[PDB]
Design a protein around this ligand. Structure first.
Ligand code: FAD
Ligand code: FAD
Lengths: 394, 394
């Protein structure tokens, strides 16, 4: 079996890299462990950078997103009874963000890949990677019990945190940087109209809460919960009582509550590997780095990794400039580390930590009062929240 | 013995509060434990906010400062071989800072208080404070062995971290917020021309260094040193070898070294008490709060405390509006906490910490790369370094 770029994973990273490449004429096969339904059941992301909106347009897959996606021009931060709105458009020089769920982006690309006839093997069990420093790397896997071989020029590991491709690099060639946080996010999806037309991130003594949305009639909410927590200890009513308690009263009062469609606990983690490549293997998205959800940067970082792997494989095939692929990691990590710092900063100023002495509680309150009350403070949150520019390539 | 405002301490806080008050006709006595020479031997501060320059002018004591002080329009930060200049004037909207040592300010006010004939008792031993919630507070002390009583309307504790007046408040009425840092600053004063016309704060693997100045021919330098350290383990040559090692080569090369006039180790500490007053006692400067030297804010915070205690005792005497003194702490702490956060931030991004995992080292490098490479990042350092505005009073 033979292809030009083999892609491990049909989550948003693999599907969008696969789409862009097909449209430029560069053949590619996607391998996925799970069924299409398993992949589409994941709720994940809601906020999308303008940079990601332009890439879906470049890939020809924006009909529904331009239709149904919501453009947002501001977000709110609430702490100490105050609600302070950051006008993102005014403060970033006109950039805005787009709310469109991750299930929906993945569905659109799954549909778009099928129409155009590109190759996708779901239920590919036991994927293994071989001969990474050769000229002919290959991938082995099992489909319904029989072991097949796929031959390629290059491999793109787009398989998330627990994928096989970071594990397939000699660990001595990698440096891992990680922080695990002492809490998670209990998220709840409800078919109810949202409490506001923009998002409200909130700092509260009991811990963090988030008001987010999927459309005019579907909502996504999160509360901070300690790592001890089991999702079956949280009834829908237990969760709504607790969300109402962490919010400003004039906002908890008009909240339309309702039963969940989905309820899950996501642990928080910062994680980076350097370099993001080995021989003919290039890592993208969560295969290479994790951010805490607080900056809404994870999927937007997959997109820039993919936008950078695509433009370098294009120069490599169309222009024969195959040497430029050694720059993939140096270009991606400049962007990745600045988003890791924004995501860490948002996480330490909006959440409640364990054994936080009186002084750190007060510096945390003062970070929020300074960045929110200063034009220069407001602009650093804002240019980072809409998303810092994408690097030029050559 | 009787006065209107009794002042404990003749360091810059007490002397400047005392000066301002005299000139408005409000009598005051200063009490000091030490001799004039002991007070003038302390080197301390070098950087002065515009806000402090206007106050010394208001107090009629700026002849030498306008003559000899250096106005600076920028500072440098060095990390990872890079030197990045912050243009303070451009980024704060024209505010600048003034370099003029603390010894010099104190000498000018000591001279100015003597000329005008105002009362100062040096070598006042064992100062005690009495009847703080009364209408007639009094101060007791010993001059050459005999115990005298001074009667006043109000008491201003301007006696630094180890003074008697914070100790004279019932501890249950106070909340202390403190962080002790795991290192100090070894400072060295030399009669040599400085290495640059502006200050260079530097982050280095070996730890922190600072290039500062007193005039065209006197210099002040600091290196980070662990708390274990004894100043007699640091010969002048040991110190110059180590300072040269923490700097960029093109800067260590043109450094003019020379023997010290003064060499001392100052420990680093953040400290705040709330409230800053009790009955007829009002705390000012280091009596109430400590910042790490990294933001050059300590003496500039004493000045705003004094500018706020003066304008409220003026309304209390001239205008009979004695009730406004209950606002002293609420007005001072808004400014104090934003400067405590800037001083803490500068401290955590320029110093080397113990048992710093790989991830925090990398976020520290990325804080410096983001705040230094962004117009909005540069403006938040800059408006905070020249000094946030002083609050209106009524
Ligand atoms: C609570 C939560 C909220 C978030 N909110 C946001 C937000 O608003 N904005 C934002 O930008 N980010 C957010 N994110 C992050 C975002 O969802 C991820 O960064 C994103 O899914 C990355 O996509 P990916 O394709 O790299 O990885 P994934 O989505 O993990 O896709 C990887 C795919 O590879 C497959 N795979 C794994 N192992 C193998 C194997 N051995 N062989 C074959 N296939 C394999 C998996 O089955 C999966 O289908 C959020 C995440 C969470 C959990
Ligand atoms: C390394 C170093 C560098 C610094 N660099 C800067 C900088 O550039 N910029 C800046 O803004 N700040 C800086 N500071 C801080 C600054 O020097 C202090 O914040 C400042 O001295 C405050 O003045 P004060 O009058 O409140 O206190 P002090 O200067 O401590 O004066 C208090 C006086 O009260 C006396 N006193 C104490 N107990 C009694 C008693 N019981 N009875 C009577 N009198 C008593 C003491 O003897 C002393 O004379 C620096 C400090 C250090 C150590």
């Amino acid at each position: 079996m033979k292809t030009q770029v083999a892609i491990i994973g049909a989550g948003p990273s693999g599907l969008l890299l696969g789409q862009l490449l097909h449209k430029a004429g560069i053949d590619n096969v996607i391998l996925e462990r799970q069924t299409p339904d398993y992949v589409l059941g994941r709720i994940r992301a809601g906020v999308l950078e303008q940079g990601m909106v332009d890439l879906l347009r470049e890939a020809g897959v924006d009909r529904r997103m331009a239709r149904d996606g919501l453009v947002h021009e501001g977000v709110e931060i609430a702490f100490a009874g105050q609600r302070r709105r950051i006008d993102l458009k005014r403060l970033s020089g006109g950039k805005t963000v787009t709310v469109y769920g991750q299930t929906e982006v993945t569905r659109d690309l799954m549909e778009a890949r099928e129409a155009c006839g590109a190759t996708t093997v779901y239920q590919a069990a036991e994927v293994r990677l071989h001969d990474l420093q050769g000229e002919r790397p290959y991938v082995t896997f099992e489909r319904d019990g029989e072991r097949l071989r796929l031959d390629c020029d290059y491999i793109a590991g787009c398989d998330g945190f627990h994928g096989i491709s970071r594990q397939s690099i000699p660990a001595e060639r990698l440096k891992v940087f990680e922080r695990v946080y002492p809490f998670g996010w209990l998220g709840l999806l409800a078919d109810t109209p949202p409490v506001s037309h923009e998002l409200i991130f909130a700092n509260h003594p009991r811990g963090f809460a988030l008001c987010s949305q999927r459309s005019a009639t579907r909502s996504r909410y999160y509360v901070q919960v300690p790592l001890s927590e089991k999702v079956e200890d949280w009834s829908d009513e237990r969760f709504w009582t607790e969300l109402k308690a962490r919010l400003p009263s004039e906002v908890a009062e008009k909240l339309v509550t309702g039963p969940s469609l989905e309820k899950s606990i996501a642990p928080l983690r910062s994680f980076v590997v350097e370099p993001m490549q080995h021989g003919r293997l290039f890592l993208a998205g969560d295969a290479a780095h994790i951010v805490p959800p607080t900056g809404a940067k994870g999927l937007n970082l997959a997109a820039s990794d993919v936008s950078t792997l695509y433009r370098l494989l294009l120069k490599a095939y169309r222009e024969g400039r195959g040497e430029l692929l050694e720059r993939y990691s140096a270009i991606c990590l400049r962007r990745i580390w600045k988003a890791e710092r924004f995501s860490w900063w948002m996480t330490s100023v909006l959440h409640r930590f364990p054994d936080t002495d009186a002084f750190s509680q007060r510096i945390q309150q003062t970070e929020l009062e300074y960045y929110l009350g200063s034009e220069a403070g407001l602009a650093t949150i804002a240019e980072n929240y809409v998303g810092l520019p994408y690097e030029e390539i050559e």
